[PDB]
Amino acid sequence: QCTVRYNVADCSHLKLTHIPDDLPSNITVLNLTHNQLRRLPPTNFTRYSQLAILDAGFNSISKLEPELCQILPLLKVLNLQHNELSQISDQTFVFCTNLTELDLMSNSIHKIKSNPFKNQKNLIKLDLSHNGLSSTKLGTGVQLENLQELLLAKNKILALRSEELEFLGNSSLRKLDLSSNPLKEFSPGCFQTIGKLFALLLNNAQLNPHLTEKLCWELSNTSIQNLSLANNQLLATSESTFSGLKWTNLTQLDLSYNNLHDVGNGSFSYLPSLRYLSLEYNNIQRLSPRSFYGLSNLRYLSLKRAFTKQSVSLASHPNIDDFSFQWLKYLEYLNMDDNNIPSTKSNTFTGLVSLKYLSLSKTFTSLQTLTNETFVSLAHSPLLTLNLTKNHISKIANGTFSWLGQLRILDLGLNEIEQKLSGQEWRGLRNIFEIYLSYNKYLQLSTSSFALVPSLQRLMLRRVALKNVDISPSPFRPLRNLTILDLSNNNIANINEDLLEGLENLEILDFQHNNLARLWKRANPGGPVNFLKGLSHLHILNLESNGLDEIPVGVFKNLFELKSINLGLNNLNKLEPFIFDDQTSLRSLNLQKNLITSVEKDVFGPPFQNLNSLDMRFNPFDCTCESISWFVNWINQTHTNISELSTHYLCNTPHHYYGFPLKLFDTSSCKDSAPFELLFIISTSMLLVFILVVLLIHIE
Amino acid sequence: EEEEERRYYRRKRLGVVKNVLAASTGVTLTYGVYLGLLQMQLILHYDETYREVKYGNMGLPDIDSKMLMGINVTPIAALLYTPVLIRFFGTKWMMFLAVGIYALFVSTNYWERYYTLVPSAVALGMAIVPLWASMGNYITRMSQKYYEYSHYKEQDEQGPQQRPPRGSHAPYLLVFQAIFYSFFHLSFACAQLPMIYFLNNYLYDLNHTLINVQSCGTKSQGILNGFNKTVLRTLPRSKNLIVVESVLMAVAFLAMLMVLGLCGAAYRPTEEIDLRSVGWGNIFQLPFKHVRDFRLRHLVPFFIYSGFEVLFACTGFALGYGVCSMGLERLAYLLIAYSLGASASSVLGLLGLWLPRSVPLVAGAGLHLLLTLSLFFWAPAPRVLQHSWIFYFVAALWGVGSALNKTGLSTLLGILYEDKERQDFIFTIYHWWQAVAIFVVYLGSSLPMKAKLAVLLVTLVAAAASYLWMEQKLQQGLVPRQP
Ligand SMILES: *[C@@H]1O[C@H](CO)[C@@H](O[C@@H]2O[C@H](CO)[C@@H](O[C@@H]3O[C@H](CO)[C@@H](O)[C@H](O)[C@@H]3O)[C@H](O)[C@H]2NC(C)=O)[C@H](O)[C@H]1NC(C)=O
Ligand SMILES: *[C@@H]1O[C@H](CO)[C@@H](O[C@@H]2O[C@H](CO)[C@@H](O)[C@H](O)[C@H]2NC(C)=O)[C@H](O)[C@H]1NC(C)=O
Ligand SMILES: *[C@@H]1O[C@H](CO)[C@@H](O[C@@H]2O[C@H](CO)[C@@H](O)[C@H](O)[C@H]2NC(C)=O)[C@H](O)[C@H]1NC(C)=O
Ligand SMILES: *[C@@H]1O[C@H](CO)[C@@H](O[C@@H]2O[C@H](CO)[C@@H](O)[C@H](O)[C@H]2NC(C)=O)[C@H](O)[C@H]1NC(C)=O
Ligand SMILES: *[C@@H]1O[C@H](CO)[C@@H](O[C@@H]2O[C@H](CO)[C@@H](O)[C@H](O)[C@H]2NC(C)=O)[C@H](O)[C@H]1NC(C)=O
Ligand SMILES: *[C@@H]1O[C@H](CO)[C@@H](O)[C@H](O)[C@H]1NC(C)=O
Ligand SMILES: *[C@@H]1O[C@H](CO)[C@@H](O)[C@H](O)[C@H]1NC(C)=O
Ligand SMILES: *[C@@H]1O[C@H](CO)[C@@H](O)[C@H](O)[C@H]1NC(C)=O
Ligand SMILES: *[C@@H]1O[C@H](CO)[C@@H](O)[C@H](O)[C@H]1NC(C)=O
Ligand SMILES: *[C@@H]1O[C@H](CO)[C@@H](O)[C@H](O)[C@H]1NC(C)=O
Ligand SMILES: *[C@@H]1O[C@H](CO)[C@@H](O)[C@H](O)[C@H]1NC(C)=O
Ligand SMILES: *[C@@H]1O[C@H](CO)[C@@H](O)[C@H](O)[C@H]1NC(C)=O
Ligand SMILES: *[C@@H]1O[C@H](CO)[C@@H](O)[C@H](O)[C@H]1NC(C)=O
Ligand SMILES: *[C@@H]1O[C@H](CO)[C@@H](O)[C@H](O)[C@H]1NC(C)=O
């Protein structure tokens, strides 16, 4: 029936109506979600009176039995969400003292005219959301001493009187939720009745400028820290709008989904302690230097989708004036993702002495070509992470990134760059660590491309149509500290031997979809290129979908630290022996959708010793003893992880074993199983010795 | 002292008869093991599963054909190097060496590889003919010794010191060769032990292995023109295979040891020096110079017919007619029925002592003639199981005819020549012609029908056989003298 694990009772999706009694009596968790209980009989909980938490959500209870709280004195978490509790009485929770968390997320409660929260002095979290409450009054006198989280969202509250909040005389309230309620007016002195207010949420509250102005004046002389006005009707902000918030020590402010037409000058001046600011998903048309005045302690700011939309009917581009963020000296994280700014001006980012993280993905629709004078504003800022994906970049000028000396992570991926990599573009990046050039249109490598950047550790060339890679010396040679190198979907037919030489720090290598069949097989200039010469610290290796039909012996020599090999979607059929001898620390090996026919010990011994997981489905095995006897004997005994073992492991040959699973293959009727090898030699020796001895004896 | 000599010669006769029985049982066990292993290897190699799964790219048909050719063509070199070799080793010693070569062929079947199975086949083809030659010489000389001891006991002074028998050792040779050939034919049934107990339960019914058979019986066009690719329903476990082959090797070694222990010694060092006094340069040409004999020129077709009919009973019947209706499930039954028929005809011909010599011989051939008629017009349907007793009927009749003809040939060849070198020479020539007949029938495979040649040969030998007897009564007078 109900699943029991460690002091829990998973009795959810079973469609049970009555109270089960087969659960152990030393249990402390009861999960009854998505059931059809009508009520909770306070007589059947005697057997497991040591219940700690109770979960009776997603049901249809109409009334709660007060005895339910005195017969189990260990009840701390009570949860009645999505039930049909009609009215709450006075004596319902009058015996319930050990209560800590009460969840009434949906009961359609309209009016409460009693003091039900008088004895639950240990209550911490209260939830009366998605109900029909019209007033925040929960009683007459001061109660709920240890109340910290009170949720009253999705109600029909129309006013916040000062008398209906007096029960919070000295209760350290931490989080208060009044979202999804159309409040029309705020009574004076209502928030002052609360002892301590830390967080306050009014998401989708349908406020106006005058409404939030009166709220800000009401929210004076309190300890509020986090404020959220998301999904609101705040069309425009003014200086007097946020005038009330100057006295309190505000920490986090949220303005999201307000459709803000513009920001008034100095509207954020009265707030000096703002640290986290959110302007996501607005329609700001103009920015001004005086707009952001007064934000000295600002450290977190996001402008994602904050500007004017595309507007196909009428072409409009939001313009930002120079010195817009000069007052923000303490800013650390700045984000303007998915914007419609035309380009970067000369002094847009001037004044940010402490800017560290900046994300500019899809911000500029007409940037196209970068210039050395484009990033001049960010010269005095020690940037650590910069993002330029989805920017439709096409060209890069000389010395564009020279101003950004302390840059560490740089992203140029998902662009249409069509230029040759001369090498002068990376000038000034002494402390750069990661470069993202994936999904670019067309590039050309050069010998001095990455010479100015020896400290590089990560480089990505996924889908770039790389060319001129086979040149001497190797362009990747100065990358002494290169750790992760990723080049896939380049279709590079010819690769020189000197490439990836001296790369001792190389650990991860990706080589998918580059067509390496012609280079290895039997090369016309000579032999196998074996570009994996001194990559000793290589850990993860991938060579999938290159169409290789054979593996030359000696390419994996001196590869001790190698852990993972991916050779799927290849055309290999015959494997030379002693190719995986150095692969003694192998963990994962993938050979799927190949032409592998036979798996032999002399080839697969060393790797299979400590192999962890293996994938070899979609392969045409030859179901013969000499072919797969050791393979079946190993896969039978070993405990390594095999994915889709009895499903996608089939044998094409012989015709008698066509479409037969490999696991059902029997190796008892094989030559290596029976000892006739030794029996033949011993019988032949004995018989020859007997015949010869008796013939030489009886002759003489 | 009369009764002491009585006991002495009684022990001598008992030793003679026990060595005769030992040689007979050794022939039985050796030939049974050889036929059983050969049949098991030929059947286990006619499928795709056991060929590709166990071996794969080792070329099973190629090595099988090479084994067959090495067994069938080596008798030529065997004849070329048998007389001097038999007189070197001895009568019983070549017997022992040939049994050892047979056991070697059985031993090299475990691993089954070119360089270990092809030399075994060559040695088997080299030892097959001299084995039978020395066997016949040994059994006939021991019958002669039995008769001479009996007539020395019954006639002390009336029996001459030189030339005791004078063509009168027939009653003591008939009863020996009859039991010898009955045991040699019971070997054919003993060979069917591994198939019945281990191989008969691993192949499926005839409804699938006999599908592509549109013409059988008189319309064969080969040994097996129509047959399925595979015949085993399941792969045989290697443990049962090694068990049955170890039992075969054990019974072969038991036959080896019992032959060595109960054959004694019948070479007689005095007669050994006598035969050595002939020389080594003239013994090589004497069997070839013996072509001028009046009896061999007419008895050679008889040997050819004996070989032809024995190979027809071995393969021409089991794989030509018995495979028509039923598959390989009742082939061993037909083989053991043929063996019991031959064993019964052995004593049936033993009972033919009062009648003169060449009475049943041609009659036996005549039997084949009658059988040949039933083997010419009647053609059984492959896809029916109506009449199955007729197969066992013809098998028993062919066994009767074959055993009668073989024992008659043996007794006539032992009676016409009484000298030791004559015995060895005539037995060698007869067995060489039999081996040539076997080799010709081997070349006679994949042919439309071998019945017309068989019947013409039986009609050429009946008249010929009678012909030889019609001149011995009129005193023609001719005998090769090469002392
Ligand atoms: C610069 O910004 C871009 C875009 O915000 C960052 O791209 C993000 O890269 C991660 C890592 O691949 C993506 O996570 C993965 O997404 C794929 C779907 O594409 C999903 O299947 C994976 O399970 C994983 O979640 C992430 O989606 C992607 N962002 C977007 C919007 O697609 C990039 O990482 C940034 N550069 C940095 C931080 O250096
Ligand atoms: C950005 O690059 C341009 C072009 O490379 C620089 O323009 C040069 O300016 C100097 C003095 O202002 C002139 O003497 C050159 O003739 C200009 N063109 C060149 C060098 O090709 C511009 O100065 C660079 N910006 C900065 C800040 O260095
Ligand atoms: C950016 O710098 C590169 C330096 O690599 C310049 O390319 C060189 O231009 C000179 C001028 O003739 C050539 O002699 C060199 O062979 C070029 N080097 C390479 C590697 O191609 C490039 O001209 C500069 N571009 C700008 C706009 O200043
Ligand atoms: C490659 O990485 C190593 C390891 O960090 C760098 O060696 C450091 O160099 C700095 C600068 O002199 C020293 O302060 C550190 O003590 C060095 N660390 C070690 C472990 O030796 C090396 O400089 C890097 N190479 C490049 C070209 O950036
Ligand atoms: C050997 O026997 C098998 C069956 O035991 C034959 O396979 C059959 O082939 C026909 C040809 O159309 C199919 O209709 C049947 O479904 C097959 N039976 C199976 C697969 O069980 C095979 O053709 C025979 N081969 C010969 C040469 O006679
Ligand atoms: C009760 O179970 C549901 C679904 O299995 C789960 O979402 C919920 O977190 C569980 N609650 C407790 C208190 O275990
Ligand atoms: C709460 O539970 C404890 C533990 O059983 C019990 O002793 C106490 O009486 C209960 N009620 C309280 C503390 O009001
Ligand atoms: C909280 O206020 C009540 C009266 O409103 C008082 O009785 C109680 O002592 C106060 N508690 C603290 C800790 O000040
Ligand atoms: C207020 O916001 C800060 C920053 O996001 C967070 O660390 C803190 O936990 C929040 N406090 C509350 C009560 O939500
Ligand atoms: C609010 O705090 C300020 C600063 O201490 C003080 O001047 C003012 O009188 C306070 N107002 C109220 C209503 O407490
Ligand atoms: C802000 O100042 C600019 C420049 O003086 C002016 O054009 C704009 O109208 C001002 N905005 C407000 C809301 O006062
Ligand atoms: C193999 O499976 C076990 C058990 O599911 C798991 O703990 C382990 O992480 C797996 N290893 C790999 C390499 O997937
Ligand atoms: C090997 O296979 C057999 C039958 O498929 C199975 O019973 C046995 O458990 C397997 N070996 C191991 C170690 O699981
Ligand atoms: C199997 O063989 C028997 C032989 O008597 C026959 O009667 C039966 O019809 C066959 N079954 C088939 C061909 O399905």
CB contact under 8 A, A626 and B108: no
Q: Determine contact, residues A244/A267, Cβ cutoff 8 Å.
A: no
Q: Look at B238 and A673 and tell me if their CB atoms are within 8 Å.
A: yes
Answer yes or no: are the C-beta atoms of B361 and B465 closer than 8 Å.
yes
Which listed ligand is nearest to A665 at the C-alpha? Answer: 13
Q: Which atom number of ligand 10 is nearest to the Cα of residue A220?
A: 1
Are the beta carbons of A99 and A74 closer than 8 angstroms? Answer: no
Kind and range of the H or E run holding A621: strand A621-622
Q: Quick one: DSSP state of residue A284?
A: B
Q: Classify residue B33 by burial, with Cβ atoms within 10 Å: 0-12, 13-18, 19+.
A: buried
Contact B313, B322 (CB under 8 A): no
Rounded-to-integer distance, Cα B326 and Cα B319, Å: 11
Measured distance CA(B138)–CA(A33) in Å, rounded: 99
- Percent helix / strand / coil, chain B, rounded to 5: 70, 0, 30
**Other residues' Cβ atoms within 10 Å of the Cβ of residue B160:** 10
**Structure-block tokens of residue A365:** 């629709």
Which of B103, B108, B241 is the closest to A680 by Cβ? B108
Which one, of A435, A441, A436, A474, lies nearest residue A455 by Cα? A435
CA dihedral over B181, B186, B187, B188, signed as positive or negative: positive
CA-proximal residue: ligand 8, atom 10 (nearest): A170
The backbone torsions φ and ψ at residue A385, rounded to the nearest 5 degrees and listed phi first, read -145, 130
Backbone dihedral region of B303: left (phi > 0), alpha (psi from -120 to 50 degrees) or beta? alpha
* Residue B195 counted as domain residue: yes
Answer yes or no: are the C-beta atoms of B218 and B63 closer than 8 Å: no
Protein residue with its CA nearest to atom 10 in ligand 6:
A31
On whether residue B481 sits in a domain, the answer given is no
Structure tokens at A401: 């990134």
Q: Which residues of B touch A653 (CB under 8 A)?
A: 52
CA–CA distance, A570 with A593 (Å, rounded to integer): 7
Tokens of B139: 């059994």
Atom of ligand 8 nearest to the CA of A170: 1
- Of ligand 11's listed atoms, the one at least distance from the Cα of A267 is 13
**Tokens, residue A327:** 């007052």
CB contact under 8 A, B238 and A656: no
- Residue A364 has what DSSP assignment? B
Please, what is the end-to-end C-alpha distance for chain A in angstroms? 91
> What is the pairing mode between strands A650-653 and A660-661?
antiparallel
Cis amide leading into A475 (omega within 30): no
Backbone angles phi, psi at B288, to 5 degrees: -75, -30
- In angstroms, the CA A614 to CA B148 distance is 84
For residue A610 and ligand 12, the question of a CB distance below 6 A is answered with no
Q: Cis (ω within 30 of 0) for the bond into B380?
A: no
All residues at 6 or more sequence positions from A237 whose CB lies less than 8 Å from its CB, including other chains:
A209, A260, A263, A264, A267, A268
Tell me the CA–centroid distance for residue A633 and ligand 13, in Å.
10
Q: In this structure, are strands A409-411 and A660-661 parallel, antiparallel, or unpaired?
A: unpaired
Can you spell out the DSSP letters for B201-248?
TSB--HHHHTTT-S--TT--SSSSSS--S--BSSPPPHHHHHHHHHHH
Amino acid identity of residue B345, one-letter, is S
Cα A153 to Cα A180: distance, rounded to the nearest angstrom = 6
Q: How many CA atoms lie within 13 A of A504 on its CB side?
A: 1
Query: What whole-number distance in Å separates Cα of residue A657 and Cα of residue B365?
Result: 51
Residues 6+ apart with CB under 8 A from A413: A389, A436, A437, A438, A439, A440, A460, A462
At residue B401, the 3 state secondary structure works out as helix
Q: Alpha-carbon torsion B265, B269, B274, B279, what sign?
A: positive
Q: How far is the CA of A238 from the centre of ligand 11 (A)?
A: 11
Q: Which is nearest to A99 in space by CA: A59, A68, A141?
A: A68
3-class DSSP state for residue A517?
A: helix
Query: What is the DSSP code string of B272-299?
Result: HHHHHTT-SSSTTTHHHHGGG-TTHHHH
Task: Choose one of B48, B216, B225, B228 to mutate for the ligand 5 pocket test, by most ligand atoms within 8 angstroms of C-beta.
Answer: B228
Count CB-CB contacts under 10 A for residue B392: 18
Cα B171 to its chain centre, rounded Å, is 23
Structural contact between residues B216 and B226, judged by C-beta atoms closer than 8 angstroms: yes
* SS3 category, B124: helix
Task: Give backbone dihedrals phi and psi of A249, rounded to 5 degrees, phi first.
Answer: -95, 80
Cβ within 8 Å, pair B49-A684? no
Contact B266, B93 (CB under 8 A): no
Nearest residue to A18 via CA among A39, A43, A4, A49: A39
Taking an 8 Å cut-off on Cβ atoms, the answer to whether B53 and A680 are in contact is no
Q: How far apart are the C-alpha atoms of B89 and B83, rounded to whole Å?
A: 10
For A694, the 3-state DSSP assignment is: helix
Min distance B237 CA to chain A CA atoms (Å): 5
3-state SS assignment for residue A420: strand
Which residue on chain B is closest to A683 by alpha carbon?
A: B107
Nearest to A654 among B52, B93, B108 (CB): B52
Give the bridge partners for A700, in sequence order.
none
Query: E strands within A340-384?
Result: 357-359, 369-370
Strand partners, A151: A127, A177
CB–CB contacts below 8 A, A to B: 80
Residue whose CA lies nearest to ligand 10 atom number 4:
A247
CA distance A335 to A325: 13
What is the Cα–Cα distance from B423 to B411, expressed in whole angstroms? 12
Which of A656, A677, A691 is opposite residue B48, by nearest beta carbon? A656
Max alpha carbon distance in chain A (Å)?
Answer: 136
Tell me, what amino acid is at A58? Answer: F
Angle, CA B145 vertex, CA B139 and CA B151 arms, to 5°:
140
Q: Which residues contact B273 (CB under 8 A, 6 or more apart)?
A: none
Q: Count Cβ atoms below 10 Å from residue A519 Cβ, excluding itself.
A: 21
Please judge whether A668 and B238 are an interchain contact, meaning their C-beta atoms are less than 8 angstroms apart. yes
Nearest to A676 among B103, B110, B253 (CB): B110
CA torsion angle A363 A366 A367 A373 (round to 10): -110
Q: Which long-range contacts (CB under 8 A, 24 or more apart) does A8-13 make?
A: A11/A35
Contact state of A624 with B237 under an 8 Å Cβ cutoff = no
Is the CB of residue A586 less than 8 Å from the CB of residue A563? yes
Do B49 and A624 count as a contact with CB atoms less than 8 A apart?
no
Please answer whether residues A631 and A611 qualify as being in contact, where contact means their C-beta atoms are separated by less than 8 angstroms. Answer: no
Q: Does residue A380 contact residue A347 with C-beta atoms inside 8 Å? A: no
Query: What spacing in Å lies between the alpha carbon of A484 and ligand 1's midpoint?
Result: 17
How far is ligand 13, taken at its centre, from the CA of residue A634, in Å? 11
Q: What angle do CA B184, B189, B193 make, to 5 degrees?
A: 125
CB A26 within 8 A of CB A2: no
List phi, psi (to 5°) of A661. -65, 150
Instruction: Give me the torsion for CA of B329, B331, B337, B340, rounded to 10°.
Output: -110
Q: What is the DSSP string of A644-665?
A: SHHHH-EEEESSTTTTEESTT-
- Look up residue A349 and give its DSSP letter: S
**Ligand 3 centre from A366 Cα, in Å?**
26
Beta strand segments in A336-376, E: 357-359, 369-370
Q: How far does B96 lie from chain A, in Å, by closest CA? A: 9
Question: Quick check: is B483 in a domain?
Answer: no
With an 8 Å Cβ cutoff, are A695 and B97 in contact?
A: yes
Locate the ligand 8 atom nearest the alpha carbon of residue A142 and give its number: 5
> How many angstroms does the Cα of residue A221 sit away from the middle of ligand 12?
57
Closest atom, ligand 3, to C-alpha of A397: 27
Burial class (CB in 10 A: 0-12, 13-18, 19+), A505: middle
Ligand 6: atom nearest CA of A79 is 13
Rounded Cα gap, residues A273 and A330, in angstroms = 12
Angle at A219 between CA A213 and CA A220, to 5 degrees: 105
**3-state DSSP helix/strand/coil % of chain A, to nearest 5:** 10, 15, 70
A379-406 as b/e: b if 16+ CB within 10 A: eebbbbbbbbbbbebeebeebbbbbbee
Question: Could you tell me which of A582, A577, A520, A569 has the C-alpha nearest to residue A543?
Answer: A569
Specify whether the CB–CB gap between A410 and A386 falls below 8 A: yes
**Contact of B64 with B42, CB cutoff 8 Å:** yes
Distance separating alpha carbons of residues B262 and B86, to the nearest angstrom: 20
What is chain A's length?
700
Residue range of the domain that includes B173? 3-472
> Hey, of B58, B92, B238, which one would you mutate to test binding to chain A, going by the most A CBs within 10 A of its CB?
B238
Give this entry's resolution in angstroms: 3.3
Could you tell me the CA-to-CA distances from B124 to A677, A682, B131 in Å, in that order? 22, 20, 10
Q: Which two tokens stand for residue A257?
A: 């989904």
Q: Which atom of ligand 14 is nearest to the CA of B385?
A: 5
Q: How far apart are CA A45 and CA A60, in angstroms?
A: 19
* Region of residue A149 (phi > 0: left; psi between -120 and 50: alpha; otherwise: beta): beta
Task: Kindly give the interhelix angle for B451-472 and B296-311, rounded to the nearest 10 degrees.
Answer: 150
CA B350 to chain centre: 19
Does residue A303 contact residue A278 with C-beta atoms inside 8 Å? Answer: no
Q: Residue type at B296? A: L
Q: What are phi and psi of B424, to 5 degrees?
A: -60, -45
Closest CA to B458 of B402, B378, B417, B393: B402
Picking from B312, B20, B326, the residue whose alpha carbon sits closest to that of residue B177 is B20
Nearest atom within ligand 7 for CA of residue A74: 2
Top mutation candidate among B207, B213, B384 for ligand 14, by most atoms within 8 Å of CB:
B207
What sign does the dihedral B20-B433-B73-B224 (CA atoms) show? negative
For A261, the token pair is 């037409």
Answer yes or no: is the C-beta of A103 below 6 A from any ligand 6 atom: no
Domain spans of chain A, in order of start: 508-669
Q: Do A578 and A554 meet the contact criterion of CB atoms below 8 Å apart?
A: no
Residue showing tokens 């303007």: A336
Q: Which CATH architecture has domain A508-669?
A: Alpha-Beta Horseshoe (3.80)
CA of A540 to the centre of ligand 12 (A): 18
Residues counted in chain B? 483
Cα gap B219→A158, rounded to integer Å: 108
Which of A655, A669, A680 is the closest to B111 by Cβ? Answer: A680
Residue B41 and residue B49: Cα distance in Å, rounded?
Answer: 14
Provide the CATH number for the domain around residue B97: 1.20.1250.20
Residues in chain A with CB shorter than 8 Å from the CB of B239 are 668, 674
Please, are residues A72 and A49 in contact by the beta-carbon 8 Å criterion?
A: yes
Helices and strands (DSSP H and E) totals, chain B? 19, 0
Residue A520, CA distances (Å) to A516, A560, A574 in order: 7, 22, 14
What amino acid is encoded at B365 in this protein? A
Query: Tokens 């001037």, residue?
Result: A350
Tell me, rounded to whole angstroms, the distance of Cα B317 from its chain centroid: 16
- How many structural domains are present in chain B? 1
Sign of CA dihedral A619, A624, A629, A633: positive
Cα–Cα distance measured from residue A425 to residue A396, given in angstroms and rounded to the nearest whole number: 7
CB atoms within 10 A of CB B26: 24
**B30: nearest Cα among B82, B110, B116, B105:** B105
Q: Which residues of A touch B (CB under 8 A)?
A: 622-627, 653-656, 666, 668-671, 673-677, 679-680, 683-684, 687-688, 691, 694-695, 698
Instruction: Pick the residue of B47, B51, B52, B102 with the most A CBs within 10 A to test the interface with A by mutation.
Output: B52
3-state secondary structure of A436: strand
Q: Which residues contact B416 (CB under 8 A, 6 or more apart)?
A: B295, B426
Q: Give B-chain residues touching A673 at CB under 8 angstroms.
A: 238
DSSP B43-77: HHTSSSHHHHTTTSTT-HHHHHHHHHHHHHHTHHH
Bridge partner list, A357: A333, A385
What CA–CA distance (Å, rounded) separates A192 from B307? Answer: 127
Stated as kind and residue range, the H or E segment containing A101 is strand A101-103
Measured from the alpha carbon of residue A564, the closest ligand is: 12
**In the beta sheet, which residues pair with residue A307?**
A284
3-state secondary structure of B416: helix
Tell me the β-bridge partners of A287. Answer: A320
Q: Is A387 in the pocket of ligand 1 (CB under 6 A)?
A: yes
Unique residue bearing structure tokens 């010469």: A533
For an interface test with B, the pick among A624, A662, A700 (most B C-beta atoms closer than 10 Å) comes out as A624
Which chain B residue has its CA at the smallest distance from A695's CA? B93
Q: Are A422 and A396 in contact (CB under 8 A)?
A: no
